[PDB]
């Protein structure tokens, strides 16, 4: 009968993070703006449940700089809220993803995206 804590990271309910695995609890374990974060992720549409993107399929971690528009909005908001080794499932509304256009065949316009994101490490 266990149910998981989902936290709204925006006021419009367009970024809702369900934590599947809690990270580490220290301040040292919290990533700052401009830090290079290393993540693994799986991206699937909410409706179809179809994987459009996975760093796990690739077997290569994804690296970016937090809080700098290197990734879709929802990622910058979601990763900013994570700590080292936190695993999560973030639900992203259209405007926190690829918007009215979507992206390629795999992401239609106005798609709700669900990403499972594990914060492996970070650094300056």
């Amino acid at each position: 009968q266990e149910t998981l804590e989902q936290v709204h990271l925006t006021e419009d309910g367009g970024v809702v993070k369900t934590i599947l695995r809690k990270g580490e609890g220290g301040e040292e374990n919290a990533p700052k703006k401009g830090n290079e974060v290393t993540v693994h992720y799986v991206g699937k549409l909410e409706s179809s449940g179809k994987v459009f993107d996975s760093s796990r399929e690739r077997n290569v971690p994804f690296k970016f700089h937090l809080g700098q528009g290197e990734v879709i909005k929802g990622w910058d908001i979601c990763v900013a809220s994570m700590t080292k080794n936190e695993k999560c499932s973030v639900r992203l509304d259209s405007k926190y993803g690829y918007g009215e256009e979507g992206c390629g065949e795999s992401i239609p316009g106005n798609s709700v995206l669900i990403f499972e994101i594990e914060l492996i490490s970070f650094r300056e």
Binding site: F62, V71, I72, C103
Partner: peptide, 4 residues
């Protein structure tokens, strides 16, 4: 693309 722009961005991921």
């Amino acid at each position: 693309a722009l961005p991921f």
